[PDB]
Symmetry: T
Subunit: 145 residues, 12 copies
């Protein structure tokens, strides 16, 4: 076993609401099951977390260090542009991470072009929807096994 | 759907705590009671919330979607200049909102000129004190009818 | 002889001379009568003024000081971003004012963010249409007491 | 009755107030006659206006809507860089316009690169002297035939 | 008929209006008389102008060229920061000018540091009150015989 | 291969390759043929060139000097914002030029505002489609004499 | 059926030219064979191209429109920061594309933070090495059915 | 009796991670003990708090005002650069505070140079490790007595 | 002792050294002599000082406080844009000062638009040559007497 | 000889001049004596230096290298924002240093936030008055041990 | 033994085409012969290259490496301010290089101040005309004994 | 007669500290001697000067004019980024100069990119060590004859 932790930032729980025509058929829950199954197939243990509170996410990352997590896949969402605390949490624990965004962040408002995490991440994926998570997982698996 | 939610941001709980003026007497509770009474008088049901925690406010606005809420009157206070998460929360639930500030924010420090919420709000009131909330409420009432 | 003065900036005379799509029928005169009536109900005298010339507005403000105007409600419109002469006029006469905008300025072009008047106004209302003027008057009446 | 309106901004009246020093012999009046003639040859009415007061120009644009002007050719001169009130006047009346400059603005002081009207114009011509006005007219005529 | 022209910008007319010690007791009119007397003592004709309208000032400068004015002393006041039209008027007539301010402009708001006239003035005086005008006149008289 | 040369920058070949509104009927060749005809009518020879490669365009400008080209009309397209080598090419040969753009550059992305060739051109035309090329030529023909 | 084109920018050819110390030993060709195979396994045609010349890449992109290419995977490399011509080419043809980089660009110099392409891509992958191209293809494949 | 409160920021709980030098053996607990002893020796009551949640820290500060704390020694850590809410909390309660950083913040990333607290603190110490807290304490004691 | 102190900054000693039509014939000593005479005529003592060393100037200003200097007229020359130490010296002693420049600083390099002293000076005079010093003295005399 | 060198920058000599109101009765001499005594008590030798001339301080730093100074405590005062030479002097000799300021610099002018020294210092203290020097010394002593 | 490669950028070939002074007489060939002769004397092989095409220069740099070039002297000319691709080529091959410019670039237009190659060059020479090339070679010879 | 002056700025005297790693075994005197000899070989008189005091350098430059120096080779070191006085000294005496730096400035901190001298120098050499001085001298010698 070699645990991988997936973290979802604020507002991701909004999943899929008013489904036709607001780019949300699938729900976070759907994304998590898919990921757990994908990890399940490669004999790797995988946990997922989400919260709208920054502190909750930071506490989770610390817990991850004590639990021997080898790699974090994180979609910080809004936090990417605002939280240095989150960056320090990932740096302080020294667990390698991949940053994931569903939507293309560079196609949005200018303040969305700045990240406190990207420069320290192994790699980033943006705009490929939920597949982005899958791709990150696939990479993370090769990296360990 | 004909319920109105008022949200107060961080540090608003400190209103009225230092005895007399500058800006004494008046409390957050005082403001809440006036607003509830105003909403009753027009036979509308008004709910309030205050928290110093960003996540708590974000969760509340999620709850607001599930409940009846038609319009949100929010004084994000400090969060206005820092929180894109709050902005995505309001945007993600698609509930229309009015931004209120007690003091003239343009009159203070330059960093206070910038807002992550103003461009998406229906309107903004700043500098009129507690009346600002009342004015936002009056408009909100004439928007449902 | 007039206790309250309302000032409308350039291009406001065009209200209601557009469409049935792009704006309805509300005109600047309609707004003025509404305000005059509101003031009369509270036994306060109200005077109004509009011009597309900056110098006419500056002269009006000077005249206001000789006439004992107690408060000024102003929608500078475009002038808000450009005229420091208007700011120095309001400052020079020392008459307190409230700034009003029909549309949400923060909503539009980046250059619309800056104002030469906001930091010196008692308060500002933007994005609530004509009601903003009423909200400002209501506040000014309370204050006139 | 005036089908196409030509507006000259501030200081344009000074044209030809000297030998071949700042410019050559040509005057604003010369430019106007050439333009009227060019319009007459194509069976199109053409009116002209110049002022050193921003408010006079703003008033003229408003008058232009009531009469039924279909296109405006404007050399704002100095105002291009300063007046958003002029921009709002052109936008509020919804009359398409072409911006013309006699001299190359991009070859002078850095501030002269900024314009409150170019992004909203159909096209712009600068640096081609009086001919620029002629080219704009030729384009305006084909647009309207 | 007048060798030197003195121009006062917007809001200068207000000098000495809030008499008991806000601005002090000195009026524009007083400054003008002192200036007229000083020029008379040197056998030089002096004329003065003030307006709150930018276009009136621009028209006056033009008139100055036809009247053979040799030097202009101007206190543009607020316009110094906003009007390129004024700058172009002074440049277009090619009359040398000295810029004067009653208060120390570098003392106040950052926006007041920027001037559309200074780089083209012969010289600038700020923060010396009315004397500044007197000093400029003294210099102008020596420059001319 | 003398007299007047017209240069088209990268992506200009695609003109009219799209039949539908995100283009139109007109193609680059069409424009070229109209311009050659317009020049022939005035007894002036006119050559044309397009390339997607910056070096090819630079080489051609050099060639133009040897060939005794008197004026260049250029639409650098994307190169306007990025190529100082093109600016130096035009400057190095010392052949006066007119810059032309089909679309209104000022109405698009902020990065488009900047140009490495506008401040050195005689003049610039943007936003008037193909007619812009024709106006520049017409100007170039009157200048030769 | 529909085709997939992969484009590599300048310097990519160098992959595998100073092999040690386990950083750069896989070659561009290796990557190309893996991608082809990946495509053939899903029965999609795939073509590849590399050049150090911007104009060559731009010509290929045009060529791609004629050939009915449905999607493009591109690693613009250095070009990503300098070439608006490349952006315009992809935009002009209207072929959707995915941006890929072998290294995390955000972890290097600041100037590498800026991209002329990213805002318009469907998505971007940076910092996952060669797997980034493969992930882009799998997404592309699923896109075409 | 007399209370001094020491607030530790997010990620501070991680002190003491890989023990023989990434950082040292020293823990937050250790620091807390030294400080408490130091205060006891001077007959001053000292409380400590740490949290990874910004709201938690904000309430604690609110609690401090009710509790009669006379001075706060805070290490905001990451929040220093991001939380105006924290600044307002300290300002709202009106308790004087000293800012402490273990590491020289000006020796790291540019984004760390900026602080929302420093300008309002009595003083600041950075880069002296745990001693920084002690010095702050020592200063605090002399200040109340 | 000395009532008024005049300080000249670096390179002022060069005045009148490139004797032909550069500078003029006027030297720093000549200016000093004129100023000393002007002061004697008004029964005021005046001292002067020049140095190319910043520390020497700073020391001189300190000495000035011990000597009871009422007002300082200073031409910092090149320092005005670089020396905060000089600013702090003038501020620390609390002696009011007038800033003077022989040439129009706004007519030169952009970096010369910035001053570490101007916002704190009573007033500034630039571009009037040596007379600037005399004007500053005249104002100083009236301020004292 | 374990030596520590304390450097004081320009304007520090002024301490304790304006005796009763603005700042207190403490002088530079007092501070130096308290520091020497502090060092003597720990059996460390301590020299001190002050100058208003940048070069003198630079020379002093060079001498220190020769004298085997092990650490430097510096208050550069105004030179912190302007002197790269001071920075290079400290770096060139490779003697570690601590930066000290008596007042809170971040609380003063925006230009005072910038330092040429901070990023290279071991640590920095500001706003704690003279104690700040004592704290730095205490730290230095423990460091040399 | 091995070789030194001299690379010349766009527009260099134009050297020597206006007499006598727009930097007349000297041609790119003259310079090349001078450099070849200088190398020969020192028994070092030297090749040269010039192109107006970026890709040609990039290709040559790749080709330089396969042929064991030890040092490159390059005058990128205009490319210095735009070409990251050129930067990556030199970096990818890992061949040290010296940057040369005939004219003083820092004099030139501000954009001309920036370089994508200066920070990575061994050294840079600018403003010394053709000698600059000779100096670099001289340096290159001693370096490559 | 003819003399070339070489000037060295602050911290240059330290050349020769730590012979194996930081620095090299060459000393300022070493260089000086090499330059004097080089000048002798060419029958030119050469003087040198170094100081850590800006004023000293400025005074030397003044002295140089009186002495008929014809060209100055200066390494201003840290002063290049901070001293406008140094620039005005070189400009005021009107002696042409070459700027030299031992290390590549462009390879260090961003603030080191800016120079107050570079635009006014004949040329600049950087990053070539001591040789840079020699190259400047060689050029200076041909320039004289």
């Amino acid at each position: 076993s070699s645990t991988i932790l997936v973290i979802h930032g604020p507002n991701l729980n909004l999943l899929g609401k008013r489904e036709p025509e607001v780019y949300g058929h699938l729900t976070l829950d759907n994304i998590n099951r898919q990921l757990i199954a994908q990890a399940e197939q490669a004999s790797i243990t995988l946990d997922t977390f989400q919260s709208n509170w920054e502190g909750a996410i930071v506490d989770r990352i610390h817990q991850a260090q004590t639990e021997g997590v080898k790699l974090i896949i994180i979609n910080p969402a809004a936090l990417t542009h605002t939280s240095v605390a989150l960056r320090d949490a990932l740096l302080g624990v020294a667990i390698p991470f991949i940053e994931v965004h569903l939507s293309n962040v560079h196609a949005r408002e200018a303040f969305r072009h700045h990240s406190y995490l990207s420069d320290k991440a192994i790699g980033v994926i943006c705009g490929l929807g939920a597949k982005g998570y899958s791709f990150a997982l696939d990479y993370a698996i090769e990296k360990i096994q």
